[PDB]
Amino acid sequence: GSHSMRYFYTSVSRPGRGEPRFIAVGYVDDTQFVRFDSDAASQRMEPRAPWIEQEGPEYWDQETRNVKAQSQTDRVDLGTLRGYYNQSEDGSHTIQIMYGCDVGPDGRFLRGYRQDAYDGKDYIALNEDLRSWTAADMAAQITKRKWEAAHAAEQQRAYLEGRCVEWLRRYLENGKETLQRTDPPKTHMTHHPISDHEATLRCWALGFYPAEITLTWQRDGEDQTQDTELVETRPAGDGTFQKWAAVVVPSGEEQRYTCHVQHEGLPKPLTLRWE
Amino acid sequence: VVVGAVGVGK
Amino acid sequence: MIQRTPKIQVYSRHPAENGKSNFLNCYVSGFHPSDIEVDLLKNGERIEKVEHSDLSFSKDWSFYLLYYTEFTPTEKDEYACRVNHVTLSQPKIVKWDRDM
């Protein structure tokens, strides 16, 4: 299928408790592979996946040098955006950054993106042509002009079309035996009586990768959404993911309901009925 | 690998 | 500024069997800001040695974390996850349900 490399930065100011915290994580699809924590002992980029551990020492200190530079500019950006919004220096504030690049099964560039945030709200985002920006408020429009004058959109695009797409390919072949695996969901259904009149059917999906999955409930062949509960897809901790979808039905009518499971590892969708 | 540069500050 | 309450899920990595080794998972997500304390409880007492995942967030910028520990479920041990966050008026306790 198609794959994506994504990095997630977080910078949280803590006034009077030292310089702001900085956490960087890198993902290939739903597989984390690198980490950086300013509060950690290493102070370096660290591997979080086996297939990245085979990179030479020149890879790690350059990835440390660049990610430390980002964290240092994230720190000054926190003091600058504080001024844009006329905020007190006693308050704690958060800068979040996400960027990445997508490739197809043929290895061709598909897409690039970058979006920044302040205190959980949009701040500035790279446009789809990778040559323009969109500011979320008048504070971000000052940054937008600073980045237009600095030609920041072309620095980001040279990376998204350049080493991002290429190193994503390199990661995809070195970790091929786990990154390109397809773990189909292992499915089963449970039944718990609610009352003398109603029961709950729960459709389970376990041990699947990647995390994208659609779990459908159908009565009489029609989709059901009332009396439904669907939990957020959750990580199992071993690299796989879990999810379930429940529905409460009149007792005795359990058999009119069908659960549908679609996933990448399933060429044919799975269908579950109570029997 | 991570991106570098991209501006001179916000 | 905006803030988001954390969603909580308490569950095991593998299906729970009394006596067999497993992992207890507490998945907190959808919250902002990232400052959060998450404790795993055994019969009300705080489990030491709990590890958590590295911080990251979703598309709406809300953060998510996975706290976990190796454990062996029995018929007599009750497990729970305690979450405290600036959004919460009091820490929220979620008890582990074997089929949830």
What is the resolution of the experimental data for this entry, in Å? 2.8
Q: Which is nearest to A114 in space by CA: C6, C55, B10, C54?
A: B10
Q: How far is B2 from chain A (nearest CA, A)?
A: 7
Residue ranges covered by each domain of chain C:
7-95
Helix A152-159 with A138-149: angle, nearest 10 deg: 80
Q: Are the beta carbons of C11 and A12 separated by less than 8 Å?
A: no
DSSP letter for A20, please: P
Q: Which amino acid is at B8?
A: V
Q: C22-54 burial string, b = 16+ CB within 10 Å, else e?
A: eebbbbbbbbbbbebebbbbeeeeebeebeebb
Q: After which residues is chain B broken (C to N over 2.5 A)?
A: none
Residues from chain C contacting residue A231 (CB–CB below 8 Å): 9
Domain architecture of chain A: domains with CATH: 1-181 (3.30.500.10), 182-274 (2.60.40.10)
Q: Where are the strands (E) in A70-212, listed by range?
A: 94-103, 109-118, 121-126, 133-135, 186-193, 198-208
SS (H, E, C) C22-42: EEEEEEEEEEECCCCEEEEEE
Q: Is A182 annotated as a binding residue?
A: no
Three-state SS at A262 = strand
The torsion region of residue A213 among left (phi > 0), alpha (psi -120 to 50) and beta comes to beta
SS (H, E, C) A201-233: EEEEEEEEECCCEEEEEEECCEECCCCEEECCC
Residues C7-95, CATH architecture: Sandwich (2.60)
Q: Are the beta carbons of A146 and B8 separated by less than 8 Å?
A: yes
- Among all residues of chain C, which has the CA nearest to that of A237? C13
Cis, peptide link before residue A210, omega less than 30° from 0:
yes
For residue A242, give every residue at least 6 positions away whose Cβ sits within 8 Å of its Cβ, in sequence order, or none. A204, A205, A206, A207, A208, A233, A234, A235, A236, C11
- Among all residues of chain C, which has the CA nearest to that of A234? C27
* Spatial separation of the C-alpha atoms in residues C34 and C54, rounded to whole Å: 11
* Spatial separation of the C-alpha atoms in residues A86 and A127, rounded to whole Å: 27
Distances in whole angstroms, Cα of residue A225 to Cα of each of A163, A244, C25 = 44, 14, 28
Q: Is A59 annotated as a binding residue?
A: no
* Spatial separation of the C-alpha atoms in residues A17 and A2, rounded to whole Å: 43
Q: Is A7 annotated as a binding residue?
A: yes
Residues from chain C contacting residue A139 (CB–CB below 8 Å): none
Distances in whole angstroms, Cα of residue A90 to Cα of each of C1, C44, C60 = 15, 36, 26
Please, which experimental method was used? X-ray
Evaluate whether A116 touches A152 at the Cβ level (below 8 Å). no
Phi and psi torsions of A82, nearest 5°: -55, -40
The H-or-E segment that residue A31 falls in is strand A31-37
* End-to-end Cα spacing for chain C: 34
